[PDB]
Amino acid sequence: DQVQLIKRKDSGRYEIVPIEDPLSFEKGFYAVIRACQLLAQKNDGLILVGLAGPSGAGKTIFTEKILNFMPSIAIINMDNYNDGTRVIDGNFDDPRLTDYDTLLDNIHGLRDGKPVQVPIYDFKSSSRIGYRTLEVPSSRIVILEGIYALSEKLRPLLDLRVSVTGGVHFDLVKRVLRDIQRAGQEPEEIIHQISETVYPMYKAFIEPDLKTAQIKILNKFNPFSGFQNPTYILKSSKAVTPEQMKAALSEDFKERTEETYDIYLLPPGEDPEACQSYLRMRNRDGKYNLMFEEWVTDRPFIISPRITFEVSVRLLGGLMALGYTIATILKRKSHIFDDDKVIVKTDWLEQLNRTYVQVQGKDRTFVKNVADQLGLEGSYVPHTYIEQIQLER
Ligand SMILES: Nc1ncnc2c1ncn2[C@@H]1O[C@H](COP(=O)(O)OP(=O)(O)CP(=O)(O)O)[C@@H](O)[C@H]1O
Ligand SMILES: [Mg+2]
Ligand code: NA
């Protein structure tokens, strides 16, 4: 865990000695920070670090913890370099999406001290909407975060190669194992076959790059962290119009609309319309998200950690190949007001032909009072949408 430097023979710049042992999330967080402090005291110019890993392993929450610890660093999200015209698919996992010409040019400019125009990618329209000016930050630390941040085209220009594995990406594999395990099967052999089925590109394209990491962070998933800081939801059948929300709520609430499509998946086996733990595939603005449906009902609230990570549609085919079945499809159209801390929205679901109001957030007192501000008392429905269609048979 001791970070030490060694002069890389190809240049005069020093480099971190590879830590062969995988590291904890909290310990890897401190190993990365101290490695940057040492690399910035022994090498001049830009300190570029590649942060690679699968979707869901925790590299996003890793970055936003480094940013809150050090606001003087800049984070570059590698998916902003995507070019939808390169592939005919919409799979974000596809390594053929990144425009390496713009990427490599951006890092050569930042190495020469120049500010560069880094692209901004809108997944809803699947196009590059514009650019943002990124100067070399004060810390001179730039984090390139992406699934292929340790690709062969980027390793010569990286000063530190960090990989993040595990998280909810691996927890889904253990969850599927809990659902489909048969007696006599060696668990490590089934785990391997689950990963090949549900993540058909991890072993081939993603993992080989992660082995070349100098700090290998293994993020062990915590099932109890979600319910420590969960999402509190109040659902109402009242007809609070979006015009009434705009006026009642503060001007800090930003207004937006969206259409989502939820696919509810049941595990294989005979759940007699009960003991049913759903997996939810959500489609929203060009992204597919897998969600775990772990719910507690404290009237009038409904509470859930809302554990979710981005997945390819291929994951749906893999789950169904492993016995998971589609219970129902829920198509909705939503009108959202977002305080960035509290969300007040109205959802219209086609299958119910009804309109519901939803106040959600991580601060339970903030959710209750905002719902009281809209006069929602006496109209609460403490049930999930999938539970409402079940009740209205
Ligand atoms: N050790 C852990 N304990 C609890 N939750 C964890 C976890 N590691 C990862 N997660 C969960 O993983 C989810 C998504 O991971 P995160 O966004 O942090 O990294 P990521 O970039 O790989 C996913 P995405 O690509 O969709 O952004 C979050 O809901 C987070 O709570
Ligand atoms: Mg539901
Ligand atoms: Na069995």
Side-chain angles (χ1 to χ4, degrees), residues 54-62 64 92 145 167-168 219 221-222 225-226 289 306-310:
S55 176
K59 60 189 192 306
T60 283
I61 197 175
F62 187 83
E64 62 185 358
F92 74 109
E145 176 267 350
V168 77
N219 186 11
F221 176 77
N222 186 2
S225 291
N289 283 268
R306 303 321 300 156
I307 299 168
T308 182
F309 67 118
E310 182 173 353

Side-chain angles (χ1 to χ4, degrees), residues 52 166 254:
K254 282 83 58 183

Side-chain angles (χ1 to χ4, degrees), residues 80-83 99 101-103 105-106 115-122 127-134:
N80 277 294
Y81 295 87
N82 283 18
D83 184 5
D99 175 15
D101 292 4
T102 304
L103 179 58
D105 285 358
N106 280 346
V116 303
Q117 292 279 117
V118 34
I120 299 178
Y121 193 76
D122 181 21
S127 57
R128 178 179 298 178
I129 51 177
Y131 296 77
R132 62 175 183 97
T133 301
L134 188 271

Side-chain angles (χ1 to χ4, degrees), residues 5 35-45 47 139-141:
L5 270 60
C36 292
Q37 300 172 2
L38 297 179
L39 265 285
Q41 293 175 33
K42 209 52 188 173
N43 299 348
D44 62 338
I47 303 302
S139 73
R140 81 232 220 78
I141 315 295

Side-chain angles (χ1 to χ4, degrees), residues 21-80:
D21 292 354
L23 206 45
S24 163
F25 189 90
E26 191 77 5
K27 299 304 122 185
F29 173 79
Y30 296 136
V32 168
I33 293 181
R34 184 50 178 172
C36 292
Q37 300 172 2
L38 297 179
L39 265 285
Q41 293 175 33
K42 209 52 188 173
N43 299 348
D44 62 338
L46 184 65
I47 303 302
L48 182 67
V49 295
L51 181 55
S55 176
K59 60 189 192 306
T60 283
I61 197 175
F62 187 83
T63 51
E64 62 185 358
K65 191 177 180 179
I66 312 257
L67 212 290
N68 297 328
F69 180 81
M70 286 189 60
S72 66
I73 80 166
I75 311 292
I76 289 184
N77 297 120
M78 190 172 168
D79 59 355
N80 277 294

